[PDB]
Amino acid sequence: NELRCGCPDCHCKVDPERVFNHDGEAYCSQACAEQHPNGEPCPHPDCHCERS
């Protein structure tokens, strides 16, 4: 899968063509990269990862 979402709960295959690199990690979206700053889950209808 190469780039595996840095989010511990959220497992999404990330593409190096278009990946949000934050703090050196590859996340499926910036929401996971920013550790859900505003409180939004990732743009994938598989899970509902968010901070709590």
Ligand SMILES: [Cd+2]
């Ligand atoms: Cd997720």
Ligand SMILES: [Cd+2]
């Ligand atoms: Cd994610």
Ligand SMILES: [Cd+2]
């Ligand atoms: Cd997440």
Ligand SMILES: [Cd+2]
């Ligand atoms: Cd995702």
